[PDB]
Design a binder for this molecule. Structure first.
Ligand SMILES: N[C@@H](CCC(=O)N[C@@H](CS)C(=O)NCC(=O)O)C(=O)O
Ligand SMILES: N[C@@H](CCC(=O)N[C@@H](CS)C(=O)NCC(=O)O)C(=O)O
Ligand SMILES: N[C@@H](CCC(=O)N[C@@H](CS)C(=O)NCC(=O)O)C(=O)O
Lengths: 143, 143, 143
């Protein structure tokens, strides 16, 4: 699990960092809490952090299931570029709501294929035992 | 864990699907990002996905703790109807903010009772060792 | 893991409780769903629950990685005061957007240091094997 736990720890650092950079723009544009609406910039910056936060648990499950049920090193490698394609994404959204697109592509690319591995790995586990049960019942005296 | 990991993988698929269906309504009603406010429909559809996303980690913990510390097959069965009662929920909220209620009931039903199992299972683990410690100290020479 | 699973179960209870208390203020100030905007109170109460929900997965990872890869009892103890410093936080934000600060301090205090432990623990695991690989290659005939 160690690499998986390393990648998750990056994720959490990355998430906390966006979170801090939202507090920064909240300061800059004098957007008093609990207001989450102001200039287009604060509204874009705050939005990135909000989308990253809603994709984090999806990324943590499936990272943990792609390692463990498919290969780990494979899973942790996707997990890694995904997080990078999310750093760049929040960097982008801060600039513009189109500088968010390029890294949002690299991110969903890496976020599926993690689903593919976790999917394959789980089928690689359930299918044999199923087909064994399927055939065993359908035998029946085999005369 | 395999069933637990199967149910979590469904969860992640279900979450990603809502996410995509929000992008669809974001397209339809021409709601340029980062705006999360428009017609009542986009505001309802976007809202479902936002509530589902905030209940996902609560559901992932407790799924994993109801299996493992109480029975797994039991946990995975609740996990399963919960996700269905969330598919139907987002389907509902899209229609109306009352067509969301019926599956929101079936969902909190399944989301507690998962807390009940995870609760029971954890007490089934800590209580014995506690009462053993309680009695051992209160002995004391037992004359 | 049992304490870690106990602390996570508290987290989930705490999260569900905020969630219920938002439904309460949603009722009180007649804020029909899917509106997430009204009086300053509903806007503060709803905001606390929204921030707590975005910090929960960050707290669940790192709790699980601070136990397991550093000491558990240590991890579960931080996890515990963090959740308390989040109960108090939502209590605070309900009162005012400054009665939120005091427990938000106690919370980020406990949320890092959990990152510190998970960080230390993961370095305590990877560094030896690395320096072993570093030295082994740089030998080379040691004449
Ligand atoms: N990551 C958080 C920063 C800390 C937080 O949870 N903010 C709280 C208390 S400081 C808040 O008032 N939310 C308003 C906001 O969206 O910044 C965020 O970006 O919202
Ligand atoms: N599941 C996401 C879809 C992808 C996403 O994270 N959206 C980002 C970048 S495409 C955004 O700009 N958020 C605005 C929104 O709420 O749709 C969502 O429903 O928001
Ligand atoms: N924890 C949730 C309560 C249940 C929920 O997910 N609310 C849904 C369906 S009842 C909703 O319509 N969201 C509007 C809201 O933010 O309360 C929350 O505070 O939003």
């Amino acid at each position: 699990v160690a690499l998986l736990a390393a990648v998750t720890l990056l994720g959490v650092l990355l998430q906390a960092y966006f979170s801090l950079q939202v507090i920064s723009a909240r300061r800059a544009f004098r957007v008093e809490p609990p207001l989450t609406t102001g200039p287009p910039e604060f509204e874009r910056v705050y939005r990135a952090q909000v989308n990253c936060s809603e994709y984090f648990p999806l990324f943590l499950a499936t990272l943990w299931v792609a390692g463990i049920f498919f290969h780990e090193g494979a899973a942790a490698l996707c997990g890694l570029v995904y997080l990078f394609a999310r750093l760049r994404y929040f960097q982008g959204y801060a600039r513009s709501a189109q500088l968010r697109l390029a890294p949002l592509y690299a991110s969903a690319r890496a976020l599926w294929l993690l689903v593919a591995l976790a999917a394959l790995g789980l089928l690689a586990h359930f299918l044999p035992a199923a087909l064994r049960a399927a055939l065993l019942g359908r035998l029946r005296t085999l005369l």
